[PDB]
Design a protein around this ligand. Structure first.
Ligand SMILES: OCc1cn([C@H]2O[C@H](CO)[C@@H](O)[C@H](O)[C@@H]2O)nn1
Ligand SMILES: OCc1cn([C@H]2O[C@H](CO)[C@@H](O)[C@H](O)[C@@H]2O)nn1
Ligand SMILES: OCc1cn([C@H]2O[C@H](CO)[C@@H](O)[C@H](O)[C@@H]2O)nn1
Ligand SMILES: OCc1cn([C@H]2O[C@H](CO)[C@@H](O)[C@H](O)[C@@H]2O)nn1
Ligand SMILES: [Mn+2]
Ligand SMILES: [Mn+2]
Ligand SMILES: [Mn+2]
Ligand SMILES: [Mn+2]
Ligand SMILES: [Mn+2]
Ligand SMILES: [Mn+2]
Ligand SMILES: [Mn+2]
Ligand SMILES: [Mn+2]
Lengths: 237, 237, 237, 237
């Protein structure tokens, strides 16, 4: 019953529910079955960067994921957010593990959104930038197994003291302030988000992924959304 | 009980409790009795601009209020905010009326805070900008008589359908997200705020004024803070 | 000989050389014959706003022109600018008049360009903002009849002491610093520009229009570019 | 005959011309004999960061220099730039060697300046950010021995192929666009600059230093300004 728009960094192929058979990035509009995907050549244990852009002139959502010294993977999709999301939203990061597992570490996150009235041609804007997360990060709403402050990082899913990821974990971090995403079909916010992430797995099989998401302001982790549902969806429809 | 740092635009001289005998701007550190003031040549019914700045290098809090084509009033005070404020705060705008009254209309409000930590030398930052306020402004916490949306403005205190301000009114607006305002592990910490305001009075004499304030995150309007205490303080100590 | 990418606000239909039979906005890639146009419901004597955006992810150049309380006109074109422009460029504003005329008054101009390089993932950036122009605006290179300082504005084309625009006029303003607009070693490259403009005509018909352009750094007004060529092109090829 | 305001990072004590007897940071107003200094505990071969701020409300120039995991050195000085500098300036970085020597490597440089008319309460602003310098850095004016592009860095003074600094070297880098620093005593720009630097010396005696400076737009390296004059002054008056 939540409304979700997300960019997923999907590390585990769930072909039974429409994943491609390889790690991929995807654009999810109200469904874990991505509207568009691109192959992702994941590098275990290297810091990656994700960049997400929504152009309100073209109403086009795009995402680029890359590592230093490697090609990027890119995916783009036409979507009118004014016709999918409520007027006010929260933005967040989500991750999960299932039978297989991985660290889901966020080293930094920034976000910018601008909403320009055509009434006044003046602009409301929100910008935030995390380059360090503290043990008491009061401007984040943490959900599930998410924690902050270990080495200054945000750990979205559970990691034991020895440093090993745990399976069957789900966690999210939403920015405290709601975001005004649209006022009309003619007035929709432009925004961009960037985060750096570190996904490590002991097994040859990391799972399940990280996502940047946009939700209704009161969104919470859906029941049974560990594993392939990325902490985002109550089912695989 | 609340911890308050404020810049006041004090329109009504309460000489009983330390006010000079003229409209003034003042720096308030945990008391309504300002640590420093400057005379403010108030112009009834003209849009004004207030600019507030602090950086941890000067450790100097300053404010400027001005109108188009007029001399500005400036006030400064040396103060070490990490010894005054809690680490996490909320920021906001407050206003009140008493026996005498005025409109306390906010046309725009922006704020930036930056924390640059001591050895990664990276930056945590928050920036917001309101050039319009709507009737359901979800990124603002409204307290007391504050309302939004009438002509796209924020009305801190009660105004009738006439456009007529009311006495004994008090209202505040706080930005939804807490702000990490200092960290004793930061090379530089700094913030700045700007707002534009319209204060109209039918009377010979406007009252009581507008303040930008910084507070503990769970700050609420103190009992008995209408009038001269500007919705900020429980008493005049 | 110059290399030009421009967004034109074309006020005068030159159907002889490919213009539609109405005022329009167009995307120009190395020719005055626009790759894409949209109809522009011009309002004589009202302040307009133009917004131009490009990012290397969409590789899509878009522009929007609008007035307060009116439908905006939008035009977009898929284009790979690293295959069109030199690596270093200057950015600027151009305008002209011909047999018919108009004022080509710029009230404000801002621009941001960002280059994020492929493996440090760091950012090189330039941002400037003009909300006032003075008589000796040293960060602008003025060409032809362009002047600054009259009522704090930039007059791209010749206006008499009357406030009366003149025919056969051409003028440009380029920002002093060259811009590193693409690097084939960048993850993301992007820019955006905004300006506000006032076009007044005594005539039935205004001419000839205003453009935001991107050029080789040593770009100058081509011989014979007054009127329909907007001070941008040597011919109508 | 140039007019110079600078923040110096002075690595070599020239006590004969008023240096303190230890490495220091200083604020120089039209003279190499700093108006104010603070002791600087320099770390050979570690990347340092310099942050410079001018507060136009207080008219106070401050500078902080630090290394990761170390205390910072700070210096502040009251100076009305409207009464010292011309209305338009260039900003730059300078360095020199003399009998003794050091690498004077710049790894990054950013600058922001805002000038707000009280006529319109609107703002002109310039921001630039270098996180990488290329071999052909067209938005920098290089003077003397300064070069760019080696490992993506700006080398202000001469370094041989083996990597060893050379004595008797002087070089500067000015940003291409002039900067509007003041319009009146009531209208002066606020600005801030940051750069990271790497000073290495083979000998126990590094010399002579790096400076952030503000000059007349046509400033050039003064004759005989190698060594203790930091490429800034024609003499030691
Ligand atoms: O291998 C068959 C199988 C897998 N799973 C589990 O592991 C997967 C990877 O962690 C998850 O995608 C999935 O949701 C489930 O938790 N349950 N059965
Ligand atoms: O004149 C007697 C008198 C009245 N008040 C009232 O009105 C003042 C102006 O609004 C307020 O400052 C004050 O707090 C009180 O409400 N204070 N003293
Ligand atoms: O009507 C005949 C005619 C006149 N012109 C002139 O005026 C036009 C409108 O200003 C310009 O577009 C054109 O380039 C020329 O200067 N072009 N055709
Ligand atoms: O040691 C005495 C002496 C020094 N210098 C030289 O070396 C110094 C350090 O490089 C410079 O400060 C000085 O300007 C000069 O070049 N000339 N004589
Ligand atoms: Mn999956
Ligand atoms: Mn998937
Ligand atoms: Mn008072
Ligand atoms: Mn007072
Ligand atoms: Mn035309
Ligand atoms: Mn045309
Ligand atoms: Mn010296
Ligand atoms: Mn010195």
């Amino acid at each position: 019953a939540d409304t979700i728009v997300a960019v997923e960094l999907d590390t585990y192929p769930n072909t039974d529910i429409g994943d491609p058979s390889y790690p991929h990035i995807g654009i999810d509009i109200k469904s874990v079955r991505s509207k568009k995907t691109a192959k992702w050549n994941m590098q275990n244990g290297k810091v990656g960067t994700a960049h997400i852009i929504y152009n309100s002139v073209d109403k086009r959502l795009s995402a680029v994921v890359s590592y230093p010294n490697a090609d990027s993977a890119t995916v783009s999709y036409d979507v009118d957010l004014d016709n999918v999301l409520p007027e006010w939203v929260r933005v967040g990061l989500s991750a999960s593990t299932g039978l297989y597992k991985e660290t889901n570490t966020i080293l930094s996150w920034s976000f910018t959104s601008k909403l320009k009235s055509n009434s006044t041609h003046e602009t409301n804007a929100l910008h935030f930038m995390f380059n360090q997360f503290s043990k008491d990060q009061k401007d984040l709403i943490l959900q599930g197994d998410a924690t902050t402050g270990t080495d200054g990082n945000l750990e979205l899913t559970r990691v034991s003291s020895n440093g090993s990821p745990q399976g069957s974990s789900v966690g999210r971090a939403l920015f405290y302030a709601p975001v005004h995403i649209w006022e009309s079909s003619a007035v929709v916010a432009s925004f961009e988000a960037t985060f750096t992430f570190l996904i490590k797995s002991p097994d040859s099989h990391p799972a399940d992924g990280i996502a940047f998401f946009i939700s209704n302001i009161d969104s919470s982790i859906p029941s049974g959304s560990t594993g392939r549902l990325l902490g985002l969806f109550p089912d695989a429809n």
